[PDB]
A paper describes a structure:
Elp3 acts as the catalytic subunit, but the loss of any of the six subunits results in hypo-modified U34 tRNAs in yeast, indicating that the complete integrity of the complex is important for its function. The enzymatically active Elp3 subunit of Elongator contains two functional domains, utilizes multiple cofactors, and conducts a unique uridine base modification specifically found only at the wobble base position of tRNAs. The two domains form a cleft that contains several highly conserved basic residues, which bind and accommodate the tRNA anticodon stem loop (ASL). The current model of a radical based Elp3-mediated cm5-modification reaction is proposed as follows (i) Elp3 recruits SAM and cleaves it to generate a 5’deoxyadenosine radical (5’-dA) in the rSAM domain, (ii) Elp3 hydrolyzes acetyl-CoA in the KAT domain and (iii) an acetyl radical is formed by the products of the two domains and (iv) is transferred onto the C5 position of U34 in the bound tRNA molecule.
We used full length and truncated versions of purified MinElp3 in crystallization trials and obtained well-diffracting crystals for monomeric MinElp3Δ1–19, MinElp3Δ1–46, and MinElp3Δ1–54. We solved their structures using a poly-alanine model of DmcElp3 via molecular replacement at 1.9 Å, 1.9 Å, and 2.1 Å resolution, respectively. Although all three versions contained various lengths of the N-terminus and also showed no signs of degradation, we could observe interpretable electron density only starting from residue V72 in all collected and refined datasets. Therefore, we believe that the N-terminus adopts a highly flexible conformation in the absence of substrate tRNAs. The main difference relates to the Fe–S cluster loop region (aa 87–123) and the Fe–S cluster itself, which were both completely unstructured in all monomeric MinElp3s. In our MinElp3 structures, we could not locate any bound Zn-ions and instead observed the formation of a disulfide bond between C384 and C389. In addition, we observed that the acetyl-CoA blocking loop (aa 466–486) is positioned outside of the acetyl-CoA binding pocket, interacting with the last visible residues of the N-terminus and also contacting a neighboring symmetry mate. We have previously reported that the ASL of (Dmc)tRNAGluUUC is not sufficient to bind to bacterial DmcElp3. In agreement with this data and the described importance of the extended N-terminus in MinElp3, we observed that the central basic cleft of MinElp3 is not sufficient for efficient ASL binding. The affinity between the truncated MinElp3Δ1–46 protein and the ASL alone are comparable to the one of an unspecific polyU sequence towards full length MinElp3. The first 45 residues seem to have a particularly strong contribution to the binding and deletion of the complete N-terminus resulted in affinities comparable to DmcElp3.
Author numbering: 74 to 87, 123 to 534
The structure:
Amino acid sequence: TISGVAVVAVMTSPGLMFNFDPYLQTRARIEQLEKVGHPTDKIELIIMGGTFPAREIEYQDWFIKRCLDAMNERESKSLEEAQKINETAKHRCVALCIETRPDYCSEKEINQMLKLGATRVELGVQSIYNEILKLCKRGHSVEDTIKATQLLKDSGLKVSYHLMPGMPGSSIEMDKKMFKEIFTNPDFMPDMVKIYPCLVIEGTELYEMWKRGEFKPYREEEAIEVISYAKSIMPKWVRTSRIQRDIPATVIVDGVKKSNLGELVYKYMEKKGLRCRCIRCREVGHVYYKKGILPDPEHIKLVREDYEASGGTEIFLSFEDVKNDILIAFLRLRDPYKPFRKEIDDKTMLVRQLHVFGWEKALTRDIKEVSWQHMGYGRMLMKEAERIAKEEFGKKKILVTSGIGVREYYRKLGYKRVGAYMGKEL
């Protein structure tokens, strides 16, 4: 199904076809999407590799500048100019996700990521168990993941965990406990998770372990059991990725090779009566595609759910059809714990995310065009966030983590640039 936001994923230098040129990769993806009539006025830029924050700042600044240059369709003198231009370009960068190892997520690196316009950070967590991490000779600890998570949350950023069921030393029950722990231990509480079973690819450490008889990866049945359990307990405030991989089956030495793992999981959950209520399962566009129904306006309500995370409080505000359990929009509001950014006081609330599910063309369903933006849901969630911040938590200013290409939207709501954020005095 076609989304209103175009995902443009690019690869950093040690993809192959363009010798890792940031501009060429970004341009080629945009043109490829325009070829098949997908909208490209809103772009989520994804920096792939996981080592980008460890590269020279000169390289990072230039790489993001050139991506924005491709979106702007013109050269710029500097990162900051490319960002300013992009605020009103035809192809706006509404979100920027950087993948990183959890030990490459210091305050200094977070400052740099904010400078670049980052709105989401994906940590290569893999496992929350130090036994498993050291057994596979990973370069980080769970303590790194916990600290990274806190620093990211207290800087207003969205946090994603890449997680790998079925690593060496793990078990079905251990993996299930990991997912339970990630959603009920405040040290974790990620906003989104990307899950795929551990695979055996030639030329990796896991391949060496496999050859020695130290590692037998999950088959489909094990992966489906774990992921089905994980989805059955995922909170309503967690967003999951489409279960998939961009790794061809002719490179998987051992492990799950089939390409419909997500569909297999769905059918397993049907058979077992396991319900899914996380964001992807309930979002208006996916429900329509999967079940053919739309929100019932007689039952749309503003809903709130709070939880403790990284020493502070997360407030998850949503508009939802509460009869049919269909999610229309949401806002992530946080009372921070131990911020370090100069713009975040102990009288500051953080709007870490505002998302109104918009234009969506379901080719396989017959109401083709469906949208929920420009209906007032975003503004009503922002107003409720401001009221909660001021009246309930006694805060005096509210800072919004804004994509470069979304700053204008918050200006319309009375926000102004405050350092790396869009802010408003309450």
